[PDB]
Amino acid sequence: GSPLPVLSWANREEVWKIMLNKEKTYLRDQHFLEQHPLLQPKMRAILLDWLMEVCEVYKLHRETFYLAQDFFDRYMATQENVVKTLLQLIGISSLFIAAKLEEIYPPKLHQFAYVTDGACSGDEILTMELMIMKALKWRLSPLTIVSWLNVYMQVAYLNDLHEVLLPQYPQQIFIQIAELLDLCVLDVDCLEFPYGILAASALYHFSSSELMQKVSGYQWCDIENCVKWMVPFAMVIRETGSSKLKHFRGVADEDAHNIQTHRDSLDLLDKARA
Amino acid sequence: MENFQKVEKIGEGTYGVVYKARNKLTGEVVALKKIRLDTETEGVPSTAIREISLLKELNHPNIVKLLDVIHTENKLYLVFEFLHQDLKKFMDASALTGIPLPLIKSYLFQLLQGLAFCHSHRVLHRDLKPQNLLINTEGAIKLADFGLARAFGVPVRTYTHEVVTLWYRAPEILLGCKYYSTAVDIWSLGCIFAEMVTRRALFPGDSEIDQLFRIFRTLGTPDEVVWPGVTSMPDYKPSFPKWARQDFSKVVPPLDEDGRSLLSQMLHYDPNKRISAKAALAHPFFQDVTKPVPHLRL
Ligand SMILES: C[C@@H](NC(=O)O[C@@H]1CC[C@H](c2cc(NC(=O)C3CCCCC3)n[nH]2)C1)C1CC1
């Protein structure tokens, strides 16, 4: 089912189908770490959490973080037998590619080298970005987890104008939902579910199945499995409370919800596995 | 890269150089965009990563095809379909005689099909100008140079300001709008349409304010009625002179009533009301060229 309104600029069912067809070109493997027997899932969580901190320090967009997450998971699924000391290099190079794709004025190469505390040189990062992009067949335009939440928040706050391209929704609930997704992406089992399903199931936890179906197009049966999985993560967020919208020096306030944040989510990830 | 023999240098930009090349075995000719990685301080340029990833997912008969990406030595070669002519050179060659109306219609139709395909894949071209529109020997014309392109989200956020070459730049860009999307490409194509008809650039400004005033002098100075919110835009000034819209009989004399209607809708001030590429394909100007498909009212 399709939740987009009629679009002045294209056939709504055309735009939606292309979005949907794209998610079948971009494969995910929730078990790819079995290709690397020397790695454990917590290592991926620690790496991704670190990239989140890096994004906040440089005021990178959430979209940039989730591209990096997607490049890392898809790249690892093409490789074998990676050791843990190589993880920082693959992650930061994933974020380098992502920042160059997404930001107007990305950070410079040496800045990406700088935040590794000298464990990764600029030269190593340039080598790794070419290996990643070649292994990914230069397929670098996924629909991220956070991009789906963006679509869902617009549709929920549509007027009778049905204008879908100019953003209009509360920043504070967007970040609260993104916080559940940021926790959830740390667990590799999230990849069992399509990114659009993950995002809709997070939105359901902050609203209802009626709103979820209205803005995502999916029926309760499609997301029931995901919602049940997300259950502990959602409660761990609920026990600790809802986060506050942050202001960022040099970021206009109408873009402030799009900047990636970071908190002690590895602690919260433990409780969810209980 | 051994099977390809460089034949001639055909282009040059900040990224690198474009060559024409001939396959030694098959006799196939291609265009090679060469990027020298030893000269690049930030690795693969952002513009090349974007263009490659976008074109990997934008296969269409009216978009110049990316055939291959080859990393060899300290070099990255982008291998493209080769076309022997661009619209800018074709217009200049046709300046004294004119381009026949059926070919103008056929070319515009094709460019709108390529653009409608970009926009439904949520891609903005953002640098549509006659030098980027390539022509082959079989009557086809194709969008090229996606180095300035950008996928847009649904909804968009604020993207790179001051895009598009000046003569083809939409008025909302010139007045400093926060958000933009597909309307900027339609404006450019409208300028190009008029330029094919009259064989002169429609708005050849030499500065941002001169470009804007050339637009105002032809289309009339916009106000809140024709363009709600124009008076609240960052670069708008109440001191702008008030000019009256010119009769399109004088702007595009050769063009019939259908063409004048389509051009007016492509040059609507309000980006929310400017015609889409898909809708433009349904315009009566093309009623002879195309036949609609039955629509499923479900
Ligand atoms: C420089 C180029 N930059 C770019 O990005 O072009 C793409 C990569 C190279 C691809 C390409 C170019 C091409 N033929 C031509 O240029 C002819 C040469 C002889 C005169 C007329 C034009 N066939 N295929 C498209 C811009 C688009 C023209």
Side-chain angles (χ1 to χ4, degrees):
Chain A
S2 179
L4 294 181
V6 299
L7 302 183
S8 61
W9 43 280
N11 176 20
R12 48 174 300 270
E13 285 290 349
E14 194 179 25
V15 169
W16 188 249
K17 253 66 171 55
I18 293 164
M19 290 175 66
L20 299 185
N21 294 318
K22 171 177 287 267
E23 202 140 315
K24 305 153 190 172
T25 303
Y26 285 87
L27 267 50
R28 280 82 205 198
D29 197 338
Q30 73 239 62
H31 294 123
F32 69 81
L33 289 172
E34 291 173 356
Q35 304 184 166
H36 312 264
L38 215 48
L39 305 179
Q40 300 288 353
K42 172 108 287 173
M43 301 174 174
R44 167 177 184 282
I46 295 165
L47 176 76
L48 294 183
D49 190 73
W50 174 69
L51 296 185
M52 265 184 258
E53 198 163 6
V54 173
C55 290
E56 193 178 15
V57 173
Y58 291 77
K59 307 166 203 297
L60 273 14
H61 288 81
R62 301 174 181 278
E63 174 69 9
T64 298
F65 167 72
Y66 276 99
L67 287 171
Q69 167 266 314
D70 184 67
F71 297 166
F72 174 78
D73 289 335
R74 279 197 291 129
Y75 173 71
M76 287 303 208
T78 74
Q79 301 303 306
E80 298 179 353
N81 296 125
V82 175
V83 79
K84 356 139 49 175
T85 56
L86 207 9
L87 292 172
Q88 192 175 23
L89 174 57
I90 299 171
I92 205 50
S93 301
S94 295
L95 189 61
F96 186 56
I97 302 152
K100 284 192 296 182
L101 285 168
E102 190 61 41
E103 309 292 346
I104 296 184
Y105 303 107
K108 293 300 197 294
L109 170 62
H110 77 278
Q111 287 169 284
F112 283 90
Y114 174 80
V115 285
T116 68
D117 194 356
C120 308
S121 61
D123 275 332
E124 291 176 310
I125 289 181
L126 304 191
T127 301
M128 183 81 248
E129 70 150 8
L130 276 171
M131 296 188 279
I132 292 167
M133 293 189 294
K134 287 158 77 165
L136 292 183
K137 302 285 303 181
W138 302 89
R139 291 312 202 283
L140 305 171
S141 308
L143 290 183
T144 60
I145 292 169
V146 72
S147 62
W148 283 111
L149 171 70
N150 203 69
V151 181
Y152 298 164
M153 287 300 297
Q154 185 73 11
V155 177
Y157 284 95
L158 275 182
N159 324 122
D160 301 336
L161 322 180
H162 288 353
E163 181 67 50
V164 87
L165 288 191
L166 197 138
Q168 198 272 325
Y169 50 82
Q171 320 188 261
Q172 188 144 269
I173 109 145
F174 176 92
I175 67 110
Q176 288 172 15
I177 302 170
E179 182 180 10
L180 174 54
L181 292 163
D182 289 346
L183 178 57
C184 285
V185 78
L186 301 192
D187 187 314
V188 200
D189 293 318
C190 73
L191 297 178
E192 172 182 350
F193 314 105
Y195 287 169
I197 287 285
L198 277 174
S201 307
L203 174 40
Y204 164 84
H205 275 101
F206 285 88
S207 52
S208 65
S209 58
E210 291 77 17
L211 179 82
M212 174 281 313
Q213 181 166 352
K214 160 172 163 187
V215 318
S216 73
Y218 305 156
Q219 314 177 31
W220 168 253
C221 53
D222 301 334
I223 70 170
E224 164 167 13
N225 212 32
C226 187
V227 164
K228 190 156 56 182
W229 173 76
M230 190 170 289
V231 153
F233 303 94
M235 264 311 102
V236 160
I237 291 282
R238 285 289 194 200
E239 299 193 46
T240 194
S242 336
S243 290
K244 290 285 182 180
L245 175 66
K246 286 181 178 183
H247 164 75
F248 295 99
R249 288 182 293 100
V251 183
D253 278 325
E254 52 252 7
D255 201 62
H257 64 295
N258 289 316
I259 304 314
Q260 181 66 45
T261 58
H262 172 262
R263 51 102 128 260
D264 269 1
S265 297
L266 298 171
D267 181 78
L268 297 172
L269 186 68
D270 298 0
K271 308 174 185 176
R273 202 167 160 176
Chain B
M1 264 300 166
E2 151 177 325
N3 260 323
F4 284 138
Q5 166 171 350
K6 289 176 181 161
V7 165
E8 179 201 3
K9 177 171 166 168
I10 59 185
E12 174 160 15
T14 163
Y15 48 94
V17 174
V18 181
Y19 305 87
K20 173 179 174 167
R22 196 193 97 274
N23 187 286
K24 295 186 311 155
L25 290 186
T26 79
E28 169 186 2
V29 294
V30 297
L32 303 180
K33 180 184 284 179
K34 188 225 267 266
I35 293 163
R36 232 136 52 79
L37 293 179
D38 36 320
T39 320
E40 300 297 337
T41 44
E42 305 299 311
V44 184
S46 73
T47 62
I49 309 187
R50 270 180 201 179
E51 174 174 37
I52 287 164
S53 59
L54 297 176
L55 289 177
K56 285 287 194 182
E57 307 215 4
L58 282 186
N59 185 77
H60 185 274
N62 298 105
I63 299 178
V64 178
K65 253 195 71 187
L66 176 65
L67 305 172
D68 206 352
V69 180
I70 302 183
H71 179 36
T72 254
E73 306 162 357
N74 255 120
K75 287 134 68 189
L76 190 69
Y77 280 99
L78 291 65
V79 185
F80 290 88
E81 181 190 4
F82 177 78
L83 292 82
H84 83 303
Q85 173 69 295
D86 66 70
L87 184 62
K88 198 259 198 79
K89 294 185 175 61
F90 179 66
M91 290 164 137
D92 295 342
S94 313
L96 300 181
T97 78
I99 306 173
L101 170 62
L103 189 56
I104 295 181
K105 193 173 307 178
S106 155
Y107 277 172
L108 186 65
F109 189 73
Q110 291 179 61
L111 293 171
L112 287 162
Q113 285 175 314
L115 196 54
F117 187 85
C118 290
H119 290 176
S120 74
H121 284 68
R122 285 141 65 251
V123 173
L124 306 180
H125 183 282
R126 304 191 305 178
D127 201 29
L128 291 169
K129 54 180 173 172
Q131 308 91 287
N132 288 338
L133 306 175
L134 302 187
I135 295 169
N136 67 14
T137 62
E138 304 166 325
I141 186 177
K142 302 192 184 193
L143 309 187
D145 198 352
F146 279 71
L148 285 165
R150 211 212 158 97
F152 58 95
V154 179
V156 311
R157 64 176 205 268
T158 288
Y159 298 142
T160 301
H161 53 291
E162 296 159 336
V163 279
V164 188
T165 299
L166 187 56
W167 293 356
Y168 304 98
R169 183 179 303 165
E172 61 269 25
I173 307 302
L174 294 157
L175 293 162
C177 59
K178 235 170 70 58
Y179 304 122
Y180 64 78
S181 69
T182 60
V184 305
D185 286 336
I186 291 299
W187 180 275
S188 304
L189 230 50
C191 295
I192 292 173
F193 181 24
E195 189 172 339
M196 288 195 278
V197 174
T198 70
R199 276 108 68 242
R200 139 117 275 195
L202 181 59
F203 305 123
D206 59 10
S207 81
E208 282 188 71
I209 192 62
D210 181 69
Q211 184 74 24
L212 195 64
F213 286 11
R214 292 185 173 269
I215 295 170
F216 290 181
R217 277 184 0 93
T218 301
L219 294 176
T221 300
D223 57 3
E224 280 300 330
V225 177
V226 314
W227 185 358
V230 67
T231 58
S232 297
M233 300 191 78
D235 302 328
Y236 178 89
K237 304 192 187 316
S239 70
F240 289 166
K242 306 304 185 184
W243 288 281
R245 180 181 185 99
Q246 287 175 350
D247 198 313
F248 272 27
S249 297
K250 316 196 307 293
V251 183
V252 278
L255 210 48
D256 56 70
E257 156 191 357
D258 278 348
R260 292 194 318 266
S261 162
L262 172 57
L263 181 67
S264 291
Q265 301 177 236
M266 298 171 83
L267 299 178
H268 201 295
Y269 270 121
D270 182 343
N272 299 323
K273 294 325 195 84
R274 187 178 308 155
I275 189 167
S276 70
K278 185 184 183 68
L281 294 166
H283 193 270
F285 184 67
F286 301 116
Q287 67 181 305
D288 51 333
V289 186
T290 183
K291 163 67 79 76
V293 306
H295 306 295
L296 172 65
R297 227 86 197 280
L298 181 61

